[PDB]
Design a protein around this nucleic acid. Sequence first.
RNA 1: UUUUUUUUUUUUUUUUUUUU
RNA 2: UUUUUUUUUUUUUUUUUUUU
RNA 3: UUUUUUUUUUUUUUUUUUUU
RNA 4: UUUUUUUUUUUUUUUUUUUU
Lengths: 489, 489, 489, 489
Amino acid sequence: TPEEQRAKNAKTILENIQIYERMCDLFGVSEDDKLIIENSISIERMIRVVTDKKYQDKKLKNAGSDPEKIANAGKVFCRLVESTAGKCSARLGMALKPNVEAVLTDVLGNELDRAAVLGKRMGFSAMFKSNLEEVLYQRGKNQLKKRNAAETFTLSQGASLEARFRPIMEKHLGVGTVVASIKNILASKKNGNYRNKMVRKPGGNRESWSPLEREISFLNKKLFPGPMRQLCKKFEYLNEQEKQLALNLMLDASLILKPQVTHKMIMPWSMWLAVKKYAEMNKGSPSLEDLAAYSGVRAFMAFNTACYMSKFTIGKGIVGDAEIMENGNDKMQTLAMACFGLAYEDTGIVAAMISQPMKKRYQLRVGNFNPPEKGTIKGTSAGYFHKWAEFGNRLPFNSFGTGESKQISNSGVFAVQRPSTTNIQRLAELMARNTGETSDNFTQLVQKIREQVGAFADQKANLREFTGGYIYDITDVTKSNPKIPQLGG
Amino acid sequence: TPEEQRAKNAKTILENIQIYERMCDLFGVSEDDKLIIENSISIERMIRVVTDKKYQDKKLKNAGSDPEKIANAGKVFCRLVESTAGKCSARLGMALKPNVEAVLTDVLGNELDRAAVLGKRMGFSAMFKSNLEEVLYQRGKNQLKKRNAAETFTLSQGASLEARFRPIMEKHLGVGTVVASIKNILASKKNGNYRNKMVRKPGGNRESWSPLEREISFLNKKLFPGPMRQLCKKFEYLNEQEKQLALNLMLDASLILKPQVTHKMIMPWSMWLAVKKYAEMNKGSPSLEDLAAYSGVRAFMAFNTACYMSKFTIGKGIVGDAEIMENGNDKMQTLAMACFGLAYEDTGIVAAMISQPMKKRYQLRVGNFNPPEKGTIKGTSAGYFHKWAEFGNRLPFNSFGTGESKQISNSGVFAVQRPSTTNIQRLAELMARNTGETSDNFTQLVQKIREQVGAFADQKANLREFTGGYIYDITDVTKSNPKIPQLGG
Amino acid sequence: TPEEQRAKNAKTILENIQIYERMCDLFGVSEDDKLIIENSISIERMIRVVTDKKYQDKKLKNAGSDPEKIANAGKVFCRLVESTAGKCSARLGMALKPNVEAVLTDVLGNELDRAAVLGKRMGFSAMFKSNLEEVLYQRGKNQLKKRNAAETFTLSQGASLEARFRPIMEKHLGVGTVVASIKNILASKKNGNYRNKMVRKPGGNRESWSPLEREISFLNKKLFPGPMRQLCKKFEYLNEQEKQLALNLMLDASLILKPQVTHKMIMPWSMWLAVKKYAEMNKGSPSLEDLAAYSGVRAFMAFNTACYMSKFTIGKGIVGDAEIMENGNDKMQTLAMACFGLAYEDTGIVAAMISQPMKKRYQLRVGNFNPPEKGTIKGTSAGYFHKWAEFGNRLPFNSFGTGESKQISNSGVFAVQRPSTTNIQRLAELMARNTGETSDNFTQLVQKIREQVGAFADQKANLREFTGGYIYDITDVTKSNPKIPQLGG
Amino acid sequence: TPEEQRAKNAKTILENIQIYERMCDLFGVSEDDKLIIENSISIERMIRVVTDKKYQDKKLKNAGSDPEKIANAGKVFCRLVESTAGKCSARLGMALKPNVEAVLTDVLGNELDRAAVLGKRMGFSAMFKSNLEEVLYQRGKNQLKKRNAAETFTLSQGASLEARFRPIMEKHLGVGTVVASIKNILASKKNGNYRNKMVRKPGGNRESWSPLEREISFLNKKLFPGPMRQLCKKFEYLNEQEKQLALNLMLDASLILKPQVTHKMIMPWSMWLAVKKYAEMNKGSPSLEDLAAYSGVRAFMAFNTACYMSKFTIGKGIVGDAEIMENGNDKMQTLAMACFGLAYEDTGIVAAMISQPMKKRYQLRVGNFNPPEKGTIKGTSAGYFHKWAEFGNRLPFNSFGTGESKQISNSGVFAVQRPSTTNIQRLAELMARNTGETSDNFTQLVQKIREQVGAFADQKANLREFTGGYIYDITDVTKSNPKIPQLGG
RNA sequence: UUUUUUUUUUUUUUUUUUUU
RNA sequence: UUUUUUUUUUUUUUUUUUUU
RNA sequence: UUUUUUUUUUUUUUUUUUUU
RNA sequence: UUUUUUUUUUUUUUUUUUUU
C-alpha cells in the first residue's frame, strides 16, 4: 500500500504542478521566474482568496449597488515577481475568476465542491503560509484580536490560518492553536462576531457535532494520556472560567509535556516545479513518486534537491530595523523553518543537520516574500541539510509505569495457606479510571500536573529521543554514523 | 467408574502416542529426537493447521487458478528438531495431507468427522499452546485485533486459541477469554469480519443456540453465585454499552473474586512418549493408567516422571533483549507453567512445590520452542516438584451467609400468646431472587460489587485455601507433613 | 404586500410562459398546438427528467463505455401533439440538453443551482402530474414498491412525486404521503435501497436535520392539535413497530379527522399560455396579476377563463375496458380534479360548482394525455364552474373545549370565608401537557383516538364548513346568494 | 431471468439424468429397460431409503451386535424391471451404499450435506411417489396411524411423504396434509412417539422456530384471505380442542373454498431420460432447456413428448378384485394423474385435454409399479394430451368486495354546508382488522364460514376459471380456439 | 466427572498505555 | 496512514506586556 | 403568506386484497 | 419465481365408517 500512497501523492503534487504551470502562464510569468518561491506564495495566496467561501459570503453582503465593486468581483489580481538584467520587480498580473476556476476545475475536476479534494491540498499550503507568518512576525495584528501572549503563541503553530482550514489541519496544528481557538470561541459566545456550526468526518468518526465537540476531540487527539486526556474528558463539565483556567494550565504544561502532535513538511509549489524541471534537466532519473510523502527522509531528499539550483529574490532592505543585518542563507534557514515546521524544534539539532550554526529571533533576518519595487535574484546554496534525521511526533517516554502484568491480586488453584501481593488500592484506581471518575478532577488534575512536572523534571535525565536518534550524513540515510549535536558550554 | 475413566484416558493418550510415533517416523525424526518437546509442539501445531476447517474454507476462497497454490494445498510442512554430535538444528519435514489423514483416520477412526473425538484432544493441545504463548509474549499481535489491556489479558487464560476451540474448552478458559470474546463479538456486529452461528452440547444441554447464549452460558458457569450470576441472568436485557460496562466491572471484580474456574494439566505429547519409553526402560512397572487423569496428584507423578531424563533444546540466544540472562531451569519453570496453567497461581506456592524460588516476567527467561539454525540439547533436572499439592477450582469461602435454617417466620402448633423472630424482609428478598427480580440490577449489582469487594477486603483475614492445604513432600502424597510457603518480609 | 405577491407570482408565471413559448418553438410545435394541455404536460415531463439530479447520478453510474449511451445523454426527447385537417398525432421532438438548459438559464438565470427558484415552480408542476396520475390509475406500479392499500392511497395526495420534490411540497401533500414515506423509510433501513441525508429550510426553521426530523416536522405541521400532535412529539421515542402501528391508526383517524392540510391550484402551463393569448385576443383588458395567486377566487377566474376556448385531444379509445364510455366533459372534470386537487373533496359541492352532476371511479372516463397515433382536437365547454366557492384547509370546529377563561382556581383579595370552583385536576393536566408528559402515550392516545372518533361521530351534527359557506354564482363572488348543494335521498 | 431459470432447471434435471444413467448401469439395467418408469420409481425409492436420516438414526438404535444387521447396513437393494423376448420380470440389483453415495456425491458434489440441493429434487420425487400412492390406495395403512377420513384424505395431497420432506414441499401439498399433520402433532404431544424441533428458511423468512410456527405459517400461506387467514392468525390462542374443531371446519370449508394452493408437474426421471434419448433419436433439435420448468405449457410439451415411445410394464393381473378390468391407457391416465397432480382436478377438463373420457375410482384400473414375477412390455399411445391448458393455483374470484376507493369519510376543502356518504362503521372494521381484533374470533369466524359458504353457493354462477380459460389444441398453445368441456346431461 | 462445526488469515522482532 | 463547509474582514511599519 | 439537494430506475395494459 | 435437518419404522392383500 505505501507505494500506491506515494503514487496518489505524486498525482496530487502533479495536479498542483499543472495548476501552477497554468497559473504561471496565465499571469504571464517568465520561464525562469516560474521557479520563484515568492511566485509560489503569490499563487497560493490568490487561491486562498478565491476559495474563502466565508469571506465571499461577507463580500456579497457589502458588494452593494456599486459597479466598481461588481467589476472587481470578476477581476482577480496577483502580485508576482518578474525579472530583467539580473534585477527584479513586481507585476500586477490580472485574470478573471473564471480563468482561475477553469484551471482548477480542469485539473481537480468540475466538482471543486468536493471540498475535501481542494481543501486538503489548500490546507497544507495555507498551513505553510501560516508557518512562514509565524516565523516572520509573531502574529501581532491577529493576536490583538485573539487576545493571548508569547508563550501561547509558541504553542499555536498554524494559528494564522483562516477558520475553515483549522478543521482540515487537525493533526499538525500546535496545541495552542486549538486552545486559543476555544478561548476565543468563549469570547465569541459573548460578542456575537461568529456563527456556530455542525460537521462530520468520514474515515475517522461519523459523529455529527459542533466546534465544542470538534475542538474537544482535537484536544483529546493531542493531550497527554492519563491526567491531561482525563481533563479532556471532563472538559464538557468544567464551567466557562474553569475551562479558561484549565486551558491555561494545560497550555503551560504543554510547554514542557510533549504528547502526540504531528509534524509535517510542505515545500512550496514552485519547489515542486523545481523538482520537475530538475528531473527534466537531469535527463530521466529523478522520480517524483520517490519524493511523494508527508513524512520520512523523502522530504530531506526533496529539500536538498531544491538546494541545487532553486531561485528567489534578494531585496537589499530587511524585515529588520537596526544597522545589523545578514545574508540569503538566513532566508534559506527561514524557508527550511517554514518548510519543516522547525519553529519550536531544537536549534542544535537543526544546526547539525543544516551543518551550520542555528539562531533565535534576536539573530534571525529575512525579507517579506512580497514582490518588490526593485531587487536582485539569488539561487540556492548546495545540499544544505548536509546531515538529515528521522522525524517524529511525541516525547521519548510517557512516564514511569506500573508493574507490566504481575503484582495484581493473586489467583490460587492449589489449596495451600498463603501470603499475597495485596494491591486492592490500585485495582480500585483502575476501576475508577475505566468507570470515568469525575469528582474534583479540576483540582486533582491541577495537582497531578504540578507533580507530573516535578517527575518530568527528574525524567529529563534520559527524556531525549527515540533511542536510535542521531544526525546522520546525506551519504547515510543508512543510519550508520550515530553522533551527538553538542556537549554543552 | 474412575478406574475405567483412567483406562479411557490411557487409551486416549495411547492414541495420541501412536499418532506421534507415526508422525515422528513420517517426518524422519531420530529416535532420541522423538522425545523433544519442541517436536511435540511442532506436530501439534501442524495438526491444528490441517484441522482448521474455517481457515481451510478461506484458503479455498483465495486458492485461485495458481498451480503453485494447488500443489502447496497437497504438501504439508513440519519444522522439526534434528540433532548430531550434541548440536541441533531444524529440518523442514514434508508429508502429504493424506499421509497425516492416514495416521489420524487409522488411530482415531475414519470418521474424524466425529468432531468431538478429534476436537476434544486437539482442544487440550491447542490450549497448552495458548498457555505457552501467554507466558511467552503477552499476546501483543493478537490483542492489536482483540483491543484490550494487560489486566484483561491476565484473566484471559486460553484466549490465544483459534475460535473453534473456544466452545470445546468451556471449563478451563480464564473468565477474561469469554469476556474479551463477547466484547469483540459486539465489534464484529459492527465490522462484519465474522459469520454468526448456532450449536448444541449433549450430556450438558440440548439447547440449540448462538454465541450469545453460548457465551452467556459459559459466563454463568464461571461467575460468582448471587450478584455476579444475577448480572449473568440479566445480561440479555442489558443494552450493548451496558454489556461492555458490566463486562468491564465484572472482569475487574474477577481480578479479586475467584468463583469456579477450572484448572487443567496438559503435558506435551513427547512427554507422554517419554513416559512410555521411561516405562519401557524401567522394565515393566510404570503404568500409564496410573497417570491417566486431567486432575489430581497423578499429574505431579507424570511431570516428575518426565523430570527424570526428558530432552529439549538450548539455544544460546534468548526470548530477551538486555545482557542479563538465565538457565534451562527457567525453561523448566516455563514448561511447568504451561503444563499446569500456573500463570496466575501463587509464585510462593509454586516456589515451595518446585522447591526453588519463583519469579515475575521481569525475571523470567526462555527460548522460542521453534527449531533452530544451530544449538545444543539438554535433559531434565531430577524430581523437580520435590513438593506437590492438591488441585482446586474456586475461592475457599463464598461469603458470610444467612442463618442456616432457623430465624425464619416461626410456626405455632400450640395455642400460646407469643413474640416472634419476625423476618418478612429477607423472606421477600428470597421471593424476589427466585422470581427473577430485574429492576435497576445494573446499578444495584454495581453497588453490590463495590461493597462485596470491601467485604472481601475484610474476609482476606482467612480467605486462603481448602482448609487441609499445604505443600507436602513427594514422599508425602499422604498429606502427613502440613507446612506453610512463607511468613512474609 | 399581497398585490406585490401577485406581481412576483405573475413574473413567476410569465417566466414559465416564456420557457414554454421557447420550448414550443424549440420542438417545432404549431401555433394552435401550443395551447394543448397534453403539450404542457409533455414539456413539464421533459423538465422533470432533465432536473432529476438523483436519477442523473444513477444514469452516470450505468452510462458505461457505450457510445450509444453517451450520445443519448446529449439528446433530449419530447413526445408532443401535432395537428392537421382536424386530426392529431404525436411527434418525437428532439433538442440537446444544452438547448433546454439555455431556455431555463436564460429565463430563470444562469444559477439554476438556486434549487429553490427552479424547484419551487417544478414542485408545483410535478405535484399537478402526481394529482393527474392519482386520479388516473390509483398508483398501482408505484404501490407494488410502496406496499400500502387503497385507503392509505386516498390520503396520499402527491405521493406519485419523485423523492426530491416531497421536501419542497411540504404543505399541500396529503398526510398519507408523509406516512407512506415514513413506513417505506423503515423498510429502506432494512433494504439499503437508499441514501440517508440532512437538510435546512430558511424562513421556516434553520434546524439542520434528517428525513426523520423532516418527516416528523411535516407530520406535526399536519396532525390534529392535542392528542395527534402529542403522538407526533412522542414519535422519536416510539419503537419501530410502535411507529408503524401509530402511523396506521393516525392514518385511519385522518380518514375522519381533517386538521390543517393545504389545498392548492396548479393549472397547466399551456392554460397559463391560453390566459396570455386570451388576454391578447381580448385587446388589452384581462391582466395576469389579477389571476396570480395559489389561493382564493382568482383561481376560479383563471380556470373559467381557460373554459372559454382552450384545446386538447380526443382519442376515440379510453382509459377504460368495458363497452360503457363517456365524453370530453369527463376529461374536463378530470382536468378540474387535477387542477384544484378535488380527488377527496365532496362530489356534491363540486357538482353544484361545475353546475353538473359528479361521479366516482366506477363512472369516471378519460384519455391518457400521451400524444397519439391518430385522434381529433376538441375545445372547452363555456364557463364550466358556473358556481364558485371560498377555499380552505381544515375541519370547521376542532373539538368542544374547556371553559374559555373562568372556572380556574379562584383568587381572593377580600378577607371573606368562601367556597371555590376547585379545579386542581385539570390544572395538573395543563401542567402535564406543557411539561411534555410521555408515560404510555401510545395506549393513552390510542384510547383518545377511539373516543375522539366517537365524539366526532356526535359532532358531525354541525361539523360542515366555515360558517359562511355556500356555492355562489360566478355573477356572485360577492357571496350574496347562500344556497346548499343537496338535501339527501 | 426466466431463461436462466430454465437453464438451472435443465442442469438440475441433467444431474438427475446422469445419476439415473449411472444407477441404471450400476444395477445392470438393459439399455431399453432404462426407459422404464417402474425403474425410475425403483431408483427414486432406493434414494429415499438411503437419504432417510431419521430412519437411519433409528436403524442404528436397533442395529445391535448382529453381524447380519451390520452387513445389510452396507448392502443396498434395488428391485428393478428386466426384459427378454417381450416378457419381463424383476431382478434384485445390489450395490454398496458407498456406490450410491459415489454417484450422488460425484454429480451433486461431495457436500450432499447441502440438504437443500439433494432434498429439493428428492422432495419433488417423493411428492410424485406420494401422488401415485394417493391415486393407488387411499393411504389406508398410513391413515390407521394418521386417524382421519376420506374427505380429509382428498385435501391431503402429498401426505404420503416421510416427515422430513413435508417442510421442503411447503407450497404444493394439499391443505389437508398440513391440517392432518397438526392434528397428529397434538396426538404426538400425548403419545411421545416424536421429537419436537426448530428450523429456519432463507430467501423466505429467517425466523427460527418450531413445527407449531412452521405449520401455522404454511397454513397462513394457504388459507383464504380475510376470515380464514384471520383464524390462521388467531390459531396460537385457540385451545387444543378449539384447534381441532377449527381445523375440522377450515378443512371442510376448503372442500369448497379454493384459495392459493400450488400445482406442480413431476414427470419420472426415466421420462426425463426418455426426453434425452428422444432428443438423441431426433438428431439435434429437441432441447431440454425448452422443457425445463415446474410450471407452464412446457410441461405438456414434455409429457406429450414422452407420449411418443416411452415404455412400461403390463401385468395381466390388477390393482383390482372383481372380473371387470381395463387397459394400459388407464395406466396412462394414472401416470398423468400422478405427473400433474390431477387427483382433485375436474375429470371433464382432463377428458377434453387427454381428448378421451375421464373416470372415478369405481372405474379406475392400474398395476402396482413393482417389478414382476412375469409380464409383458408396452409403449405409449401418441400425443395423449391432444388438447392442453394454462395452469393455476386459486379460485377465479375471491369475494364481492367493498367500493374500490370512493364512499369513504369525505374530505372538504371548500367552506360549503354539506351531506356526507357517512361510513364510520366499516372504517372502524378496517381499524379492527389492522389492529388484530381477537374477541370470539372462533364463533365469529365459524359464522363467517357458514355465511361465506352461502355467498359462494350464490357466486358459483360465475366462479369457474381465469377468464381466458379453455382446452386449446396442441396445434394451439397460441390459445386461438376457445371451447368448453361439457354442457351437462 | 463423561460426548461434535465450519468464511477476517501466521512457519520472527524486544524492557511496550491506545489506528505505526 | 487514507477522505468535505460556509456571515467579524487584509494586497506594509519595527528590537514590543495588556482597549492607541 | 414569502425562500435551496443529490446513488434503487419509466417514453403502455385494465372493472384488481397481499412477492406473478 | 429462486435456497438446508435429523429418534415410532415397510421391499403385498381388496369394492372398506371408527383400536382386528
